[model samples]
Target: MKNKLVVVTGVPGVGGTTITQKAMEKLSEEGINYKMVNFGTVMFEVAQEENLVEDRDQMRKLDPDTQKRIQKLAGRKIAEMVKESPVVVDTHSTIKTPKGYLPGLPVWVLNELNPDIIIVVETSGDEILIRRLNDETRNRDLETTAGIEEHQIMNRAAAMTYGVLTGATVKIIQNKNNLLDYAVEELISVLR
Candidate 1:
């Protein structure tokens, strides 16, 4: 079977990274050959090179216009990097934005890739906020009360835009409990 390109996206703390990690693990356990690639890493590298923002929290603080510009620059690089690989792209801005609004920048960049699968994961806004506040893996700079709210708004916008642009079959993943099995099953069915 030919390798597949899977682009997984969602608002931050909505379980996008978690789902990607779990799915990749399952694929590995099944002896399936696949490569894990995170688009965020590409963006971070570009940001570092451009001196746009030094860290994730600073990146988040950037104005929307700058953020889109950075994304466009990084998207092109990421597309090139995955040109010949069956990769899984895990990203926050890939789909979800302030209120789920799809910025033309990322849409145009992703259009170039023409990925085999684009998965948008979603969770309740309240749940996402809670996770962002409590999750230790996230940048400590974003733990501020105001920062948390800003993150929520941005993610909601991205999610809405993602649905509007791609309209790819969406699978909502609730992180209320350990529901990774449901997400994995959905992905398996979709891939098959």
Candidate 2:
């Protein structure tokens, strides 16, 4: 079997990292060979190279237009990395506003990378908001702390928008609890 690329994305606090980690572990146990790349890291590198944004929080502070531009650049960078091998690309900004047109912006560059599967994970607004407040390890700063409600709304809306835009073939992973189990089931379905 040719190696396949799996692109996994979701809003923050929606368990993208957790689910990807679990999926990698399961794949490892099954003797599957694959590389895992965090697209955020790629973005950070790009930002550092261009002196765009200094940190994650700064990236969040960027206006939607700038955020989208940086994400497109990052996506292109990640795509280059995965062009020769099967890898799992995980990102938080895979979905954007579904309306209007932007000149010189490519839509879904990550999706165009020819991923064998695209998985969008989502959790409830209440759950994400509560987690954001209570999860100290997340290290969210003052701005994010103040805008938790807005972020929750935007994330939920983006998840729904992306789901609709991607149509029926996209896998929707509802991560209410035990994300590992959900990911395992999804992977098994794909493998089967």
Candidate 3:
């Protein structure tokens, strides 16, 4: 699995990032190497170059055309990184915007990244709501438990679509409250 790309996604506050970090650490302990890339941070750099948004959250609000371009650029950048080492791309499969839901990976972006595996990290909606309440880092959009549940469904559906389009395997790991270690182990199993 040298230089392969693994895409990991979950809705905000689901602890997907934490699970990925832990799994990567577990791999590193066994002498495996994988680099983690945040899709939004790469897209945010392109958005900054275009003078489009003030913060990462505002990225979801950009016009569709602009968003597409940024997504493709970010995908290309990540794809290039796979030449250096295996990459675990951390991103959302579907982004919720004021207008509606947006497919985070359009065809062109998928073509660029061409992931080998896609993992959807998820948890109960109520747990997601509680996790969001504890995070004060960004001005997150308000979402109720029902809305969060719907969003997780959207992420799963979109990830399956991505899997079909790119021939990438799709796996879902549940990160339920107080069971994060189990989720991390599940993710590591998939990676291995």
How much lDDT does each candidate structure score?
Answer: 0.61, 0.60, 0.89
Pairs that collide in candidate 2 are none
lDDT of 2 at 81: 57
- Tell me how many clashing residue pairs each candidate has: 19, 0, 0
Give the alpha carbon lDDT tens digit for every residue of 1-192 in model 2.
236666676666767777677666776677665577876677678777888877777876677776676767776776665656557777553333234212111356544444555566766666676777777887554434334345444544554454455442356677765455866567545533
Q: Candidate 1 lDDT, tens digit per residue, 31-90?
A: 664566676677678888988877877776778787767777776666665556556667
State the number of backbone clashes in model 3.
Answer: 0
Between candidates 2 and 3, the one scoring higher on TM-score is: 3
lDDT of 3 by residue, 1-192 (tens): 368899899988888999999999999988777999888788998788889888888985689788888888889988988998889998889988776788878889999999999999988899989888887896576789999999988999999999999999999999998898999999998878
- Tally clashing residue pairs in candidate 2: 0
Instruction: In model 1, state the lDDT of residue 31.
Output: 65
**TM-scores, all models, native as reference:** 0.61, 0.61, 0.87
**Over 4 Å off in model 1, which ranges?**
1-3, 46-73, 81-83, 93-105, 137-170
Candidate 1 residue 119 C-alpha distance from true site, Å: 1.4
RMSD of 3: 2.6
Pairs with steric clashes in candidate 3: none
Per-residue error for 5 in candidate 1, Å, reads: 2.4
